[PDB]
Amino acid sequence: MRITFNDVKTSLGITESYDIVNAIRNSQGDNFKSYVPLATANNVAEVGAGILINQTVQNDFITSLVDRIGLVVIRQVSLNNPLKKFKKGQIPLGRTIEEIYTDITKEKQYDAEEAEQKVFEREMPNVKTLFHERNRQGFYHQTIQDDSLKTAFVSWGNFESFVSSIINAIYNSAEVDEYEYMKLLVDNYYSKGLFTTVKIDEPTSSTGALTEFVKKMRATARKLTLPQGSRDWNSMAVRTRSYMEDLHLIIDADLEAELDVDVLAKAFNMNRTDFLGNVTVIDGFASTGLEAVLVDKDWFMVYDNLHKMETVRNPRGLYWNYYYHVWQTLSVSRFANAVAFVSGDVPAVTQVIVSPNIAAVKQGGQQQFTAYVRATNAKDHKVVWSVEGGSTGTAITGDGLLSVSGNEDNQLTVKATVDIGTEDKPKLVVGEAVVSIRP
Amino acid sequence: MRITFNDVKTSLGITESYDIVNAIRNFKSYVPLATANNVAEVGAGILINQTVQNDFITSLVDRIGLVVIRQVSLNNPLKKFKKGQIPLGRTIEEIYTDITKEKQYDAEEAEQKVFEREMPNVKTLFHERNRQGFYHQTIQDDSLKTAFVSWGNFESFVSSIINAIYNSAEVDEYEYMKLLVDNYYSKGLFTTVKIDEPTSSTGALTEFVKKMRATARKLTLPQGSRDWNSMAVRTRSYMEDLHLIIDADLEAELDVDVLAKAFNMNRTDFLGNVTVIDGFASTGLEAVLVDKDWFMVYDNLHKMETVRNPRGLYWNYYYHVWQTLSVSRFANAVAFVSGDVPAVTQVIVSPNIAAVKQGGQQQFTAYVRATNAKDHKVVWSVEGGSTGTAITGDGLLSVSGNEDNQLTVKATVDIGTEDKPKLVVGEAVVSIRPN
Structure with missing residues (x-):
């Protein structure tokens, strides 16, 4: 085991542009005339960017002696996740999280004559629920051969510094991956079209x-x-409220540069033009038309289940293995406000939502469905209704009222369709709900 | 086979939770020492770091599982054949003096000889069979984190990690007994009795x-x-010491009663003396009746060893059980076969191995285990090879002088015909000492 290199030049990863060493020596009033008086300019131009591998150099006075390394410096760096402020507590027990929201009801009219027989009737509350599952399990592996690493150092102080460098690099990797995973949530949420889109033309135009x-x-x-x-x-099309201090606007660096250079500097009373909520800056979004995302603090549903470190020792190879296990849940709540602020060409209708997504109806029961259409334009749209139950005797009217025949037992899907395309080229946006038959 | 938390509760002198692990291991100031209703504190202390978690889980599984499984494997129905640790210097041999008559009182006859010895102890060697194996099982970190929610979850986890190994070992013991019985029958030292298909x-x-x-x-x-x-050594057995090993089909066909009435016991004390196995896989063997001391087992050791995989985040614990099985050569053992067994099974020489001088004589007698009342004649051969060293037809062997080799007396019985590819013989070693 003796690794050795020979016959290597100090221009390995070099792609010269104009060869400053030659450019200096032939100048007549050029900008390079300042370096003409310099005597030892060639050596500086040769080894002024550093070299990748060094060779043994003999001393210039006594050739037997060899020049030695006079300084060893070890670089350290610490990385952090700027989105770490959007996290929550730990959930050691369980793999799922349940979220429950209750809505408002409808007002009735006072009637003493009809209140004498409907005293015991019941009105069912509107309640919706969602689930989140654990969706990240990973580990980081690093090996350290401390026994064989002793030949590269001559002072004990640098040994622990160098090993701690790797130990810290592990956590840096974990932080970088956590940041990327959190950004993926916003990216895929916009990809699925669940954002409420506001159409702008172009910020930097x-x-x-x-x-x-x-x-x-x-x-x-x-x-x-x-x-x-x-x-x-x-x-979820529920009636909810948000507070100003809980609103976060996520933008990129170019946007704030344009903002403060153009319209903030030249603005008397600049507090009447700047952003309102808490402004966070990232390195741009992966989506095409996305410019700035406005979300509520509760919109994030990120949790961490496991963060552990394990060590193994090899008595034969004399080395240590380090494993860092990280388990997490990445999710977003649909009960919180969210605005996309998209700039490109967007469809007229993004989505349609049926308010009751889960229905439990008896054989002869009835249900009411309401449709909310998210439109990007001031024009209105019309919604058609259909049922894919499969049996005869059940149907829904134009206002979303359902009638179910007794002699049936299967899954029923209620579909609301809106047409946004032109004639001869149909384009439909649909929303569905699941209905369960009870005997 | 259905052991629960009650079994460990009775095996140990404790109730519900225990802190012996954190008493015996710093580790003390890492988990609460109380036995109160608090479980979140103990869970957090156990899971606070991998070193403490591993130490606790290893000590728990190793010590507690060893104690519980060793306590519970000695209470299984086949415990009367089970003994403690093997005694030192067993010499793997059995010695048994043959019971004889009493000499009549005679002063004139007695005054001639007073230092005369009586008889050799006709001892033999053990028939042994060693066993060593392991089972091994795995436990995950998820179903250790989800085991401190309530005090019942912890005991359920303990029962889950004990029961599988315990029942596997209990099942395997019966199979090892069946293989030992099969090997003994293959050797053919059982005394045979002919029956004709009891289930027919x-x-x-x-x-x-x-x-x-x-x-x-x-x-x-x-x-x-x-x-x-x-071997014919004149042993007697008692009624309550007879143990029966019978096939599953035959036991199912037979009723619990009348079979017990054949002995002097009545059902309740007969279920503990009858053992049922599923198949013998040996020709036509049906049911074996052996003495109580016929079969013995000595447990060399039981051990639990654990190792953690951190790449996969789990533990593996191995249960190693080593023990030896022995069968006595002086206990009664009847085979009760049904098939085409030969008329003569084996001829046995009573003197077995003997020592004689260069000019002595020795009397050899033989017992033939014949399946029929028809008498069979025995011919005596000297083998050996010398001049003057021969055995007569009555079993008297005379050793000639100037002899240096060791001879082997043989008794042969012919149960064939004109073409006789069969020969049952019995060998007897005779060792000569110089005169």
Whole structure:
């Protein structure tokens, strides 16, 4: 075991542009005339960028002696996840999380004559539930041959520094992967089309477009925080409210650079033009038309289940193995407000939602379904209704009222369809709910 | 085979939770020492880091499982054949003085000789069979984290990790016993009795029951039989010490009653004396009746050893059980076969191995284990090879002088015909000492 290299030049990963060493020596009033008086310029130009591998150099006075290393420096770096503030506590027990939300009811009219026989009747509350599952299990592996690593150092201080460098690199890898996994949530959430999209033209195109985007964001942020709530900003179409201090706007660096260079510097009373909520900056989104995402604090459903470290020793090879196990759940809540602020060409209708997604109806029972259409334009749309139960005698009317025949037992799917395409080229956006028959 | 937390609770002198592990291992100031309702504290302390978790789980599984399994494997139904650790210096040999008559009082006859010895102890060697194996099982970190929610989950986890190994070992013990019985029958030291397919008809069943009763009454004769047993050494057995190993089909066909009435016991004390196995896989063997001291087992060791895989985040624990099985050559053992067994099974020489001088004589007698009342003649051969060293037809062997080799007396019985590819013989070693 003796690794040795020979016949290597100090220009390995070098792609020269104009050969400054030659450019200096032939100048007549050029910009390089300042380096003409320099005597030992060639050596600096040769080894001024460092070298990748070093060879044994004999001393210039006594050739028997060999020049030695005079300084050893070990570089360290620490990396962090800027989205780590969006995390929550640990859940050591269980692999799933259940989320329950209850909605508002409908007002009735006072009637003493009819209150004398319907006293014991019942009204069922509107309650919805969602589930989140554990979806990340990984580990990081590193080996350390401390016994054979002693030949590379002459001082005991650098040995533990070098091993701690690897130990810290493990955690740096974990942090980087955690950041990427958290960004993947926003990316795939936009990919699935569950965001509420606001159409802007282009941020980095003109000052007018930039200030129009600012106005649109301000109006949207104001609309989110109304005391009576709204159903236009969450994928579950429930009446919810958000607070100004809990609103986070995620943007990229180019956007803030354009903002503060163009419209913030030249603005008297700049507090009337800047963003409202808490502003976070990242290195851009993977999606095409995404510019800035406005979300609620509760929108994130990230949890960590396992973070452990294990060590193994090999008595034969004299080395240590380190394993770092990380288990996590990555999820997003659909009960929180979320705005996409997209700039490219978007469809007229993004999605349609049926308010009751889970139904439990008896054989002769009835159910009511309401449809909410997320449209990107001021124009309206019409919704058609259909049932794929499979049996005869059951059907739903145009207003979403269901009638079920007794002599049937199967899964029923209620589909609401909206047509957004032109004639001869149909384009449909559909939403479905599952109904279970009870005997 | 169905052991639960009650079994470990009775095996140990404790109830419910225990802190002996953290008392005996720092590790003390890592988990709470209370036996109160608190379980989140103990769970967090156990799972606080991998070193402590591994130490606790290893100590627990090793010590507690060893103690519990060793306590519970000695209470199985076949415990009367089970002994403790093997005694030192066993010499793997059995010695048994043959019971003889008493000499009549005679002063004139006695005054001639007073230092005369009486008889050799006609001892033999053990028939042994060693066993060593392991089972091994795995436990995960998930179903250790999800075991401290309530105090019942922990005991359920303990029972789950014990029961599989315990029942596997209990099942394997019966198989090892069956293989030992099969090997003994293959050797052929059982004394044979002919029956005819007890399950073929109801008459065959009652014939088998009557034959079993007659054999038991002959075996339990107070005066001694010498007819049974591997070698004719005149041993007697008692009624309550007879143990029966019978096939599953035959046991199912037979009723619990009348079979017990064939002996002097009544059902309740007969279920503990009858053992049922599924198949013998040996020609036509049906049921074997052996003495209580015929079969013995000594447990060399039991051990639990654990190792953790951190790449896969789990543990493996191995249970190694080593023990030896022995069968006595002086105990009664009747085979009760049904088939085409030869008329003569084996000829046995009573003197067995003997020592003689260069000019002595020795008397050899033989016992033939014949399956029929028809008498068979025995011919004596000297083998050996010398001049003047010969054995007559009555079994008297005379050793000639100037002899240096070791001879082997043989007794042969012919049960063939004009073409006789069969020969039953019995060998006897005679060692000569110089005069």
